[PDB]
Structure formats: C-alpha cells, structure tokens
Symmetry: C5
Subunit: 95 residues, 5 copies
Amino acid sequence: MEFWGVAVTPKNATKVTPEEDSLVHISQASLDCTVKSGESVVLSVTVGGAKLVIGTLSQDKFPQISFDLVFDKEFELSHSGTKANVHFIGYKSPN
Amino acid sequence: MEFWGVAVTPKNATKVTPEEDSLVHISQASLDCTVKSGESVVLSVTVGGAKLVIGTLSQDKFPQISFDLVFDKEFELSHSGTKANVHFIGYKSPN
Amino acid sequence: MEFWGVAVTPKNATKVTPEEDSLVHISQASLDCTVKSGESVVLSVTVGGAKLVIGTLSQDKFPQISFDLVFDKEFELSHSGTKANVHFIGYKSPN
Amino acid sequence: MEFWGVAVTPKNATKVTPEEDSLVHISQASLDCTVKSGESVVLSVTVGGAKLVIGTLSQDKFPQISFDLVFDKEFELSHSGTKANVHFIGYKSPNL
Amino acid sequence: MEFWGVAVTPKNATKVTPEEDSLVHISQASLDCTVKSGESVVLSVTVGGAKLVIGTLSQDKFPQISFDLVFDKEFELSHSGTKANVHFIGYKSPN
Ligand code: NA
C-alpha cells in the first residue's frame, strides 16, 4: 500500500488511472479554500461514462467528508466549486 | 474488488442482485438535488421480507451519509425524496 | 458475510443472539420517525449484565450514527425514544 | 473477536490492559449524561507516558464520536467531564 | 498493529519516517485547545513534492475528524492553528 492524493481545481477534471491489477482507495475529500464562500461544492466521479455525486462540501458546514471508495478502473474527479480546490487523499493497493 | 454505484430516483425502487459468491458494499449515499428543498429524504433498504431505514438525508443539514453496509443477496433501495435523487456508491468484492 | 438488521421499538428491548463462531457487526443506527419530535433518543446495549450507552439520536440534529460495533455473544438493544423506532443495520460474519 | 466496553466516570482514570498478543479496538465514545450541561468533555488516552486528546464530546453538539483506535499495550482513559460518564465500546482481537 | 500518536504544535512541522515495509495509519485528528478560539485550523500533509489539505478543524464546530489515512514513506504534518495543538492518532502496521 502507498499514499495517494490529488488536488482538483475549479473547472478541471482530474483523470486517475489505477495501475493494472491495482486499486485506488479514496478516503477523504477536503476543501482547500481560495476565497471565503458559502457555495455548495458538489463532488462528482465519472466511471465508464456514468457520473455520480459523491458528496457536497461547503466551507462553513461540510468542510470535509470521510469515504470508503474503491476504484479498479479509470475514473474522473470533478466538482462544482469556484472558490475552492478539493483535495482527495487515500492510497493505492493491489487488487 | 470493483467500483459500484447506482442513482435512485423518486418513487422508484432499485433492485440490486450481488453476483454469486460476491458482495455489494455500500459506502456512501449522497443527495443529487433537483430542486432546492428542506425535505427529509428517508432512505430504505428491503432485504427478504424486511424494510429498514438506513438514514435520513436533507439538502441543507444532511447531504450525505457514510456507511459500512454489506449485502450478500438481492436488495432494494428506495427513498422518500421528491426533489432529489440519491446516489449510492461502494464496491463489489468476493465472499 | 450476510446482511443483518433489526427494528427496536419504544419501551421494548430487542434480543440478538449471534450463532456460535459468528459475530454481529452493527454499522448503523437510524431513526424511523413516527411522530415529529425533538426528543433525545438514547441508545443502549446490554451485554452480560453490563448496560452501555452507544449514542444519542434526535430527528433534527442526529438522525443516524455510523458505527463499528462487534458482538460475539447475546446482547439486547433498547432506546429511550417514544416517537420513533430505531433501525439497526449491519452484517453477520464468521468469528 | 469479542465485545469490549467500559464506563469512565468523572475524576477516575481507567487502566485497560489488552491480553498478551492481543489488541483493544475502541470504536465509539458516547456521553452518558448525569446532569444537563453544555460542558466540553475532553477525552484523553495515555500510552507509554504520552497523553493525547482523542476527542471532545458535549451533550448538545457532540454527544458521541466514532473511532478507529487500536491499543496493543496498556493504556489509560480519562476525561474532563463532571456532569456525564463516557461509555467506550469496541472489541478485542488477536494481534500476532 | 501498534498504537501511534503525535502532537503537532503551532508553527512547527512534524516529520515522520516510517520503518521500511511498514505503514503509519492515521485514524483521527483532534484539537487540544490552548485558549478558546473560533479559528479554522487547516491540517496539511507533505509527502515528497505533494502538499495536501487533510481537513479543517475548529474548537466550536469541528473539534475532531475521523479518517482512514495511510503513509508508507516519509511525511510531514502541520497545521495553521495558533490557539490549539492537533493530536493525530492511529497505528503502525506491516506493509
Ligand atoms: Na469478505
């Protein structure tokens, strides 16, 4: 098992490609605020053309979420925030 | 292990059948809001005869829940919301 | 591993008996509201003559709790609510 | 694996000794209120002469915490509350 | 597994170097308040050239976070608080 993480900025999708026979586990998403805002930051993941909401963050009420997410194939993280980045952390492991 | 997720819309149940000798793990349920609302979105699962509440979401107070649920047999997810979908995410694994 | 859950009603204790060499894992407790109420719903477990509080729920502030509880021997669940049931969910696994 | 739990009262530190080659996993701490109060109940553990905060409870805002704590050796639980007990629950398991 | 915990003070980074083929699992971060404050305490970790936000604590709203973090190599913890320490707790295990 190895540390993994990525910072996802406004208006940009991050593609993540697990290595063959490996997984990416996402444990947490946290706001990295840029400008003070009450905006709702909707987190999404796209896997094989399906886009699912994985939570809503906000600076004042929901600054982070703890998760038990597992990805065996390529996925794309994105969010609706414009006044924050979202930092995803977890780990890689064999599958 | 493999990524798993489903979107559950108002009024309709989603029936999920774990593959033979496999499990579905549900890790999170998150609101995908359609219209701004303070409604309570009661989440239920039906397994065998039995329907159980697995949490209450709301756009403003409880927009997601993190879970450690495991299903070995057919189950049905539904919710009482009318102004949001609920997106369930987790993973499949053996056993 | 197998799905497990129980509904615990006002004023009544629910007894749960793990089979020999099995465990019951409780993952979640959620309010199943009957009448709208601000009451505090204190959750208890009794195991071998010890009674312990395992959380306090409320419809408005704490409608559910996520847990990592393990029971290898008979136990009883009860709560102090009168305007809701509490639905406990998790799984059985080998011990 | 086996159920484990202990009640920790005001002004009483509780020593817990895992069995040899075993661990205690603490999964939850919950307030067992005695007198209605907004006090902050700071939970601490001491292991090997180091005392660390494991969380803060309160009757109104934080009545419980869910944990993934593991202790392989003797430890001591304590808290700062005077108007509640704290109930700690989890399990024992082998640790080889 | 073995108990692991560290106290991280204002203005000081804490470097951790796991043993080879071992990991540090961090399970929680909690404020150890020094003076009453509503400050936001932003938690960060550095792993090589990466620096990621791992949550935001506050004495009044977010005094602790529970998470599932894994570090296999050197890392450094820090936070932006000035009116509290942050206590990070988890366990060491083989990798
Ligand atoms: Na399994």
